[PDB]
């Protein structure tokens, strides 16, 4: 587990006031001077405070110590460190974890670009001395509490407002110098430990402390962390009721007005071409064997539940694809299929769906079989504080709710297929932050700026079309008219802002 060790906090002020927040791999709470070539003179780090947990591997009398520099330790009941070789010890047991802490207060920074180079060793009964391995050390769960950093989530309101970027260290946003090398600025809320309205928190996200499977686009505190299942068909095979195999394509819906929706679905057509060449009365039905596969265009992964799809023609339903909960070959990987292309699809009527002559004459005239996957998802991955294991919690469902109410839509299809994402954004009609169509299209589909030019792997942006919603269409005629394209920095977004994006 990459994210395994103790979380550190450094301050330029001799008495805790923030400056930088970077994790530590283990007992060596260092910060090489080669990782501060972005901070002005204020490299001479002054104080520090490492918090986190600890889970030994055997009940024994441990002794925490460090080379020198003034420091204290809060190992649940006792103070320690300083520099002494004696100490008063402290009992630690296997299977038990212990919230830590490590104050530091060096006044004179004789070390320019101050290495600080603080080392922490622990000696048990046996004369075995060595830096605490990252196998016993663990970071502090930042996951939203139960029922100056106001929200209480490992960040300062100053950084949540004025923003904060994150290199392999994480720190405040410094316009010029930083965005130079190419870094995504983070905007956050101070009264919502999790703006995107999700399990994970602001700090946890940007840092990475989250589900490894989540889509990189889901690493911002402004970009939700949910999945968006759905079901696609690959070929329908109908016959007589005691053969009509048809290969067709599927598409990702983005219904228009005359949309405050965001559920799941998949339009469908029928290749009316003659696959070779070529007896229905009226009082006859039909037997249809269709095969379909799942799709995950969300920013997260699904585990337990298997959503329920609603197949229909015109408006006349036909069958429903009830998903089997508590059973899945392999999770529904973010942007993955179930089964995967590495296996065979799953026919609704693998080895019934009826229809009447009136329906049989309406399914072939044009061609369309709607599959509107409702909105049902199983359990997700919650970081376990004690053992430090991303395990199957207890459901997803009640998570989608708050999301939509505070997040706006946004779909694509650049890479090779479709990718739906949600973008946090308050409503027009007070704690959230302000977002625009740009910054939203910079953390929704990863499209930064090399030289202030919006690009996608080099691919121009003057090579992608648009597909907003009727509302925003006129709301864009207002937003635009007031200004003039080029700026692209006045195109604010609101909740339920249905938006799509093709590509030429």
From TrEMBL:
<dbReference type="GO" id="GO:0005576">
    <property type="term" value="C:extracellular region"/>
</dbReference>
<dbReference type="GO" id="GO:0051260">
    <property type="term" value="P:protein homooligomerization"/>
</dbReference>
<protein>
    <submittedName>
        <fullName>C2 toxin (Component-II)</fullName>
    </submittedName>
</protein>
<feature type="domain" description="PA14">
    <location>
        <begin position="2"/>
        <end position="135"/>
    </location>
</feature>
């Amino acid at each position: 587990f990459t994210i395994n060790g103790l979380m550190g906090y450094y301050f330029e002020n001799d008495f805790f006031n923030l400056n930088i927040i970077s994790p530590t791999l283990d007992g060596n709470l260092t910060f090489s001077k080669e990782d501060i070539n972005s901070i002005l003179g204020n490299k001479i780090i002054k104080s520090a405070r490492w918090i986190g947990l600890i889970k030994p591997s055997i009940t024994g009398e441990y002794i925490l110590s460090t080379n020198s520099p003034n420091c204290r330790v809060e190992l649940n009941g006792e103070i320690f460190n300083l520099s002494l070789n004696t100490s008063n010890t402290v009992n630690l047991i296997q299977g038990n974890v212990y919230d830590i802490r490590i104050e530091q207060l060096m006044s004179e920074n004789q070390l320019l670009k101050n290495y600080e180079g603080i080392k922490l060793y622990w000696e048990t009964s046996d004369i075995i001395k060595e830096i605490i391995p990252s196998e016993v050390l663990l970071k502090p769960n930042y996951s939203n509490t139960n029922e100056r950093d106001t929200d209480r989530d490992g960040i300062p309101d100053e950084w949540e407002i004025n923003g904060y970027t994150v290199m392999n260290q994480k720190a405040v946003a410094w316009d010029d110098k930083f965005a130079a090398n190419g870094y995504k600025k983070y905007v956050s809320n101070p009264f919502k430990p999790c703006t995107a309205n999700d399990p994970y928190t602001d700090f946890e996200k940007v840092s990475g402390q989250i589900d490894p499977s989540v889509s990189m686009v889901a690493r911002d505190p402004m970009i939700s962390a949910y999945p968006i299942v759905g079901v696609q068909m690959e070929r329908l095979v109908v016959s007589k009721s005691e053969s009509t195999s048809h290969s067709s394509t599927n598409i990702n819906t983005v219904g228009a007005e005359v949309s405050a929706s965001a559920n799941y679905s998949h339009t469908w057509q029928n290749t009316s071409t003659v696959d070779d060449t070529t007896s229905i009365n009226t009082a006859e039905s039909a037997y249809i064997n269709p095969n379909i596969r799942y799709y995950n265009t969300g920013t997260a992964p699904v585990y337990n539940v298997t959503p329920t799809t609603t197949i229909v023609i015109d408006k006349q339903s036909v069958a429903t694809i009830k998903g089997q909960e508590s059973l899945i070959g392999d999770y529904l990987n973010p942007g993955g299929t179930y089964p995967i292309i590495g296996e065979p699809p799953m026919a609704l009527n693998t080895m019934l769906i009826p229809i009447n002559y009136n329906q049989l004459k309406s399914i072939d005239n044009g061609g369309t079989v709607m599959l509107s996957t409702s909105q049902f998802t199983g359990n997700f991955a919650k970081y376990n504080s004690n053992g430090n294991l991303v395990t199957d919690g207890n459901n997803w469902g009640p998570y989608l709710g708050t999301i939509k109410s505070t997040t706006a839509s946004l779909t694509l299809s650049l890479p090779d297929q479709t990718t739906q994402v949600a973008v946090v954004a308050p409503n027009f009609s007070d704690k959230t932050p302000r977002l625009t169509l740009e910054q939203a299209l910079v953390k929704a589909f990863r499209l930064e700026k090399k030289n202030g030019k919006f690009y996608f792997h080099g691919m121009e942006i003057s090579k992608i079309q648009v597909f907003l919603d009727r509302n925003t269409n006129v709301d864009f005629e207002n937003q635009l008219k007031n200004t003039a394209n080029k700026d692209i920095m006045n195109c604010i977004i609101k909740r339920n802002m249905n938006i799509l994006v093709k590509v030429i």
